[PDB]
Structures are given as structure tokens and as C-alpha cells.
Amino acid sequence: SGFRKMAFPSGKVEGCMVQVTCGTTTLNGLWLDDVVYCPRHVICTSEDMLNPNYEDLLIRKSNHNFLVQAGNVQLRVIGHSMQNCVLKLKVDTANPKTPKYKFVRIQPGQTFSVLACYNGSPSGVYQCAMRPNFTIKGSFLNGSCGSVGFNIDYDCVSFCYMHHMELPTGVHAGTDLEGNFYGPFVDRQTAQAAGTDTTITVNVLAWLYAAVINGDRWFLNRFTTTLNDFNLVAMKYNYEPLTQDHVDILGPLSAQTGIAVLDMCASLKELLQNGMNGRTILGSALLEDEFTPFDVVRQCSGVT
Amino acid sequence: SGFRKMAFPSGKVEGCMVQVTCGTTTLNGLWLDDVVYCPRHVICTSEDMLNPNYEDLLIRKSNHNFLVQAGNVQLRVIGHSMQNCVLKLKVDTANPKTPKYKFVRIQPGQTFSVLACYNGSPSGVYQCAMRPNFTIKGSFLNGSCGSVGFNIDYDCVSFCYMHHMELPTGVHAGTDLEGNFYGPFVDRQTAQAAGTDTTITVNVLAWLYAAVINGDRWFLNRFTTTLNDFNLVAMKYNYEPLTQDHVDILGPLSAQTGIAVLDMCASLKELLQNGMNGRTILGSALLEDEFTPFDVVRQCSGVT
Numbered sequence: 001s002g003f004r005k006m007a008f009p010s011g012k013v014e015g016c017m018v019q020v021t022c023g024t025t026t027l028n029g030l031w032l033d034d035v036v037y038c039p040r041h042v043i044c045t046s047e048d049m050l051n052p053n054y055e056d057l058l059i060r061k062s063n064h065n066f067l068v069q070a071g072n073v074q075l076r077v078i079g080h081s082m083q084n085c086v087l088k089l090k091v092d093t094a095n096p097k098t099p100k101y102k103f104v105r106i107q108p109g110q111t112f113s114v115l116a117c118y119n120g121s122p123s124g125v126y127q128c129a130m131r132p133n134f135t136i137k138g139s140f141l142n143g144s145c146g147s148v149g150f151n152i153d154y155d156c157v158s159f160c161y162m163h164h165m166e167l168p169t170g171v172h173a174g175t176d177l178e179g180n181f182y183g184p185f186v187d188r189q190t191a192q193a194a195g196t197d198t199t200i201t202v203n204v205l206a207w208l209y210a211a212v213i214n215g216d217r218w219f220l221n222r223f224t225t226t227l228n229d230f231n232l233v234a235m236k237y238n239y240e241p242l243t244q245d246h247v248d249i250l251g252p253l254s255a256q257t258g259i260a261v262l263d264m265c266a267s268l269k270e271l272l273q274n275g276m277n278g279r280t281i282l283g284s285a286l287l288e289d290e291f292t293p294f295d296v297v298r299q300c301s302g303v304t
Numbered sequence: 305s306g307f308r309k310m311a312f313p314s315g316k317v318e319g320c321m322v323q324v325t326c327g328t329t330t331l332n333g334l335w336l337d338d339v340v341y342c343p344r345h346v347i348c349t350s351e352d353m354l355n356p357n358y359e360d361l362l363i364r365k366s367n368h369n370f371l372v373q374a375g376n377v378q379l380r381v382i383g384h385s386m387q388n389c390v391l392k393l394k395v396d397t398a399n400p401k402t403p404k405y406k407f408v409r410i411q412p413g414q415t416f417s418v419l420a421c422y423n424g425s426p427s428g429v430y431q432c433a434m435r436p437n438f439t440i441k442g443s444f445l446n447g448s449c450g451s452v453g454f455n456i457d458y459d460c461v462s463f464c465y466m467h468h469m470e471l472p473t474g475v476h477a478g479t480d481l482e483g484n485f486y487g488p489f490v491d492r493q494t495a496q497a498a499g500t501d502t503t504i505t506v507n508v509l510a511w512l513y514a515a516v517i518n519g520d521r522w523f524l525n526r527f528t529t530t531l532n533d534f535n536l537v538a539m540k541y542n543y544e545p546l547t548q549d550h551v552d553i554l555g556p557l558s559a560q561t562g563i564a565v566l567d568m569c570a571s572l573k574e575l576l577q578n579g580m581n582g583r584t585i586l587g588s589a590l591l592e593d594e595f596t597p598f599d600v601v602r603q604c605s606g607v608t
């Protein structure tokens with residue numbers, strides 16, 4: 001028992017982190033097979049970030065201008081190409097620690113682990129959610145760019161995020177591993193609006209089921225609701241609308257606990273309208289939305 | 305910017321996890337150099353746990369009864385000894401992935417990362433605190449015993465915890481890597497009282513400094529207090545008494561923010577007496593005590 005904000009073991013990803021330097025800019029790269037992936041802004045100076053023309057900036061760079069260091073050894077760069085907002089540096093050596101991997105574009109509301117890195121070295125790992133507005137609330141300092149987010153399914157690492165930018169609001173923005181930004185963001189130093197963020201309703205419900213499994217049951221009530229009535233409340237409290245697709249993925253948790261999805265929706269409705277009344281759920285005084293129904297099933301069953 | 309409950313990268317520890325089986329009991333072991341460390345209750349059946357005589361139970365076991373599997377290969381056990389509540393299995397092969405390491409006994413209030421494992425395989429990593437009552441609030445299912453807690457300082461892994469038991473309250477108890485339980489616990493299936501738990505005051509103050517660094521400043525007030533007045537309030541709210549030693553370790557955070565330790569104590573006093581008034585600090589609606597002053601300095605500076 002017990003329920004924690006658990007990250008995936010980061011070993012398979014640590015073995016892929018390298019340092020990439022171009023001119024005076026240094027950031028993190030991801031070495032998979034004979035390719036190193038990093039944010040394309042490694043070719044910019046601070047002044048270039050105001051309005052960069054990446055095609056023109058990259059044209060002035062050659063393979064020998066990209067310094068790639070893995071641990072203490074230097075990698076020989078034999079090719080370079082830009083794909084959307086990432087640079088792909090072809091190296092003459094395959095990473096011997098390359099795990100089985102995939103590049104995946106996650107959906108808003110999905111969770112992943114971030115391995116925060118500086119100078120190609122890992123400092124920490126944490127679990128977070130891709131917000132419905134395509135930002136992440138990470139912990140990233142200067143030099144953290146190129147740090148990646150991922151999920152693991154037994155021996156396969158599905159890379160889903162690469163860190164690029166911190167918005168003036170202190171929230172974070174990045175790309176998938178093909179260099180496409182999540183959200184409307186561009187890699188320029190210009191104030192960019194992240195949309196209205198909402199609470200990931202399906203995740204909160206999954207976390208309420210995780211609380212029932214671990215013994216926190218005070219929030220259970222004698223009521224029920226409909227998907228329509230619940231969504232009227234969710235919209236009022238800036239929660240994402242719950243669909244039958246969301247109800248479907250809550251099925252295993254509904255089965256284990258014997259608490260129907262709409263009954264759990266009624267508990268969530270009362271918590272939204274009345275608050276916690278100074279009480280806690282799984283050690284939190286607010287409604288947690290950073291665990292998906294899959295995360296709750298995985299943690300409660302022991303998937304290694 | 306941003307502040308997360310960050311765990312240490314778990315790679316160095318993943319390379320040390322093995323599965324240990326003795327009879328019908330399987331749990332996790334820690335392979336360092338030519339020794340495998342695991343909870344001594346691996347030699348018990350469920351029935352034996354009621355009132356085990358470990359000296360007598362171990363006497364019936366020989367080296368060949370301890371099955372140790374690392375990944376897919378079997379390790380040859382050439383010796384066995386009990387040290388307090390851990391078994392040390394001498395193997396004929398040194399773990400080639402043994403990182404630089406130390407065995408350390410942490411103090412109550414200190415934090416560490418847990419690599420939860422099942423059948424010698426890592427499933428997740430999370431950061432937690434050793435409670436003032438020597439329990440931890442982990443996330444451990446059946447088969448998680450032998451999972452370890454640790455800290456990392458550049459290339460050295462200081463192992464501080466090995467998981468052994470879940471109390472009837474759902475909280476967790478374990479030993480240091482010499483097999484000494486943290487707290488008054490014994491490895492027997494008998495209801496055991498964990499003392500009154502308290503909030504780790506120095507950690508809450510460090511986390512308030514981390515909030516100021518990241519922009520959450522609403523809780524700052526025009527007041528100050530004394531160590532005596534503050535401790536009268538801390539005792540009322542079941543907080544640990546703050547000592548000059550605690551004030552001393554908050555020094556770097558006090559310097560960075562320009563907010564004197566007793567001024568931050570006054571903010572904490574008002575938060576204890578009045579609550580948050582429906583507001584959040586670093587995305588939490590309660591006072592977080594799972595970040596030490598060292599953790600806040602490390603995360604805010606970027607120690608890899």
C-alpha cells in the first residue's frame with residue numbers, strides 16, 4: 001500500500017545523455033544508435049534568440065562545429081540535419097547503451113518522466129503531466145535544454161518530450177523527438193501565450209480510485225450523477241469535459257473498487273462544490289491530476 | 305524555474321538489483337562487489353513470520369538454498385551470514401556494474417530516493433523522507449521487500465534504506481544496509497506501534513524558501529518571531545522544534561532570498577495559525593516537509 005508520484009527508472013535514458021556544444025552554447029543531447037538529437041537553438045547565441053532564422057544560422061555551421069561529449073569521450077560528427085526544431089547529428093559510433101526505443105507524440109493529459117540534465121549529466125528524475133494547454137510544469141534551470149521526457153514498457157523507452165523553453169510565466173515548453181513543439185510555441189525569445197489550462201478530470205478520477213484502494217474513503221458519498229450533470233460542474237471549475245472514452249479507461253478501477261464511474265464523478269462533484277474541508281486525500285490537500293488511469297493500474301499492480 | 309519532488313537518477317542502483325529466492329519466498333537483493341544484501345525474512349514462510357527465530361531458521365539453510373538471479377543469469381552463492389536483519393550472500397562474482405558506494409544511516413527528517421523493485425526488476429523511483437518516527441510513507445506492494453533507498457553525491461551512491469515491512473497502518477519500516485531497523489521495529493508479524501509523527505519544520509522552511517525563489521511569495525508577511533515563540537507554535541501544531549543547527553543549515557537560502565530565518569519562521573507561524581485560505585504554494589495546498597535545505601539548494605543550483 002501507499003501511493004506515490006513515481007517516475008520510471010531512469011537508467012536506460014541516463015545511458016543516452018550527452019553534452020552538445022556549438023560555439024558558446026552548450027546543452028543536452030540524446031544519443032540513440034548513431035544519431036544525437038538536441039534542440040536546434042544550440043546554434044544560437046543569446047542575441048540570435050530574439051528572431052532567429054535557423055536555416056541561415058545552420059548554414060554557417062559544419063559537422064566539426066558540433067562538439068558532442070559522452071561522459072568523457074568525444075564523438076565524431078559525420079552529418080547534421082535539422083528536422084523541425086531539433087538537430088540530428090549523425091555520429092560515426094552507435095551508442096552501445098542504446099535501449100529498445102520508440103519516438104511517440106503523447107496526448108495532452110498523459111504523463112511521463114523527465115530526466116533533468118546539465119552538461120550531459122543527469123541530476124534528477126520526476127514525473128509530470130503534459131497539461132491540456134501543451135505546457136509542462138517542470139523544474140528546469142539554465143543548461144537543462146535537451147533534457148527528455150519518456151515512458152517505459154518493460155524494455156522499450158518511448159521518448160515523448162525534449163525540453164526547449166521556459167515561458168515568461170515559469171512554465172515549460174518543448175517538442176516531440178521529431179522536433180514538433182507541443183502547443184503553439186515557437187523557438188524564439190518572444191512572449192508567447194499558453195492557453196487556458198484545465199484540470200485533467202480523468203486523472204483526478206483515477207487518483208480518487210487510487211485513494212479508495214489505499215484506504216482514503218472519506219470523500220465517498222451516497223450520491224450519483226450523469227455525464228451531462230457532471231460536465232456542467234467540470235466546466236464551471238475549469239475541468240476537462242469527461243467523455244465515454246475516459247469512463248472506458250477507468251473500467252479496471254471501477255471493477256476493483258466496485259464504485260461505478262458516475263458514482264466516483266458524484267464524489268468529485270461534491271469535492272469541487274464544497275472543497276476538502278481541511279482534509280487530505282493521499283497526503284494532498286488538493287485534487288491531483290498527474291496520474292493517468294494507466295499509472296494507477298500500473299502502480300497498484302506492480303508493473304516492472 | 306519550477307520546483308519538483310525530484311528523485312536521484314536511479315541508473316547506478318538499477319544495475320545492482322537482483323532477485324533472491326529461498327524456498328518459496330522471493331524478494332529483492334542488492335548486489336555490490338561480491339556480496340548480495342537482502343532482508344533476512346527471505347528465509348521465512350508466511351507462518352514463520354508470526355514469531356520467527358531467525359538463528360534457527362537460517363541454520364537449516366545452506367548456500368545452495370539461496371537462489372540469486374541478476375537479469376537472467378544465476379549467481380553462485382559461496383557464503384552466507386546474517387548481520388542484524390539482513391542476510392549477506394557472498395557470491396563468486398563481483399557485480400561489474402557496482403558503482404562507487406557507501407552505507408550510511410540517515411537521520412530522521414532526511415530525504416532519499418527509493419527504487420521500488422519486484423522480482424529484482426525496477427518499476428519506479430520516488431523521493432521520500434524518513435519521518436521523525438522512523439517510518440517512511442512509501443509505495444510498496446507484495447514482493448517489494450529488499451527495495452533500497454539512497455542518495456547520490458556525483459559518482460557515489462550512499463545506500464541508506466532497505467525495505468522490510470509494512471505496518472498495519474499502511475506505513476513502511478526498514479533497515480540501514482547493516483540490517484539495523486530505523487525505529488523500534490522488529491521483523492515479526494506483530495502489530496507494532498510507530499510513535500507520534502511530527503512535521504519536519506526545517507524542511508518546511510526550506511520549501512518556503514524554494515517557493516520564494518520560484519515566485520510564490522504571497523505567504524510573506526510584515527512580521528518576525530523568536531526561536532522560543534516559534535517553538536511554542538511548532539509544538540502546538542505537532543511540528544519538530546527548530547534548533548540553531550536547523551537555522552544554520554538554512555543560511556544559504558536566507559542569503560539568496562534576503563529573508564532572515566526568523567522572518568520565514570513568522571510566515572510559517574501565520575500559515576499554521578490561519579491556514580492557506582484556499583491558496584497554494586508550489587502547487588500544494590499543504591506545508592510540504594519532504595525537501596531538506598540541502599535538496600532545495602541542490603535543485604535550485606543544478607547539482608548533477
Ligand SMILES: O=C(Nc1cncc2c1CNCC2)[C@@H]1CCOc2ccc(Cl)cc21
Pocket residue numbers: 041049140141142143144145164165166167186187188189190305
Ligand atoms: O527558454 C530558454 N531556456 C531555458 C529553458 N528552461 C529553463 C530555463 C531557461 C532559461 N532561464 C532559466 C530557466 C531559452 C532562453 C530564453 O529564450 C529562449 C527562446 C526560445 C527557446 Cl527555444 C529557448 C530560450
Ligand SMILES: O=C(Nc1cncc2c1CNCC2)[C@@H]1CCOc2ccc(Cl)cc21
Pocket residue numbers: 001345353444445446447448449468469470471490491492493494
Ligand atoms: O510486511 C510485510 N511485507 C510487505 C512489505 N511491504 C509492503 C507490503 C507487504 C505485504 N502486504 C502488501 C504490501 C511482510 C508480511 C507481513 O508480515 C511481515 C512481518 C515482518 C516483516 Cl519484516 C515483513 C512482513
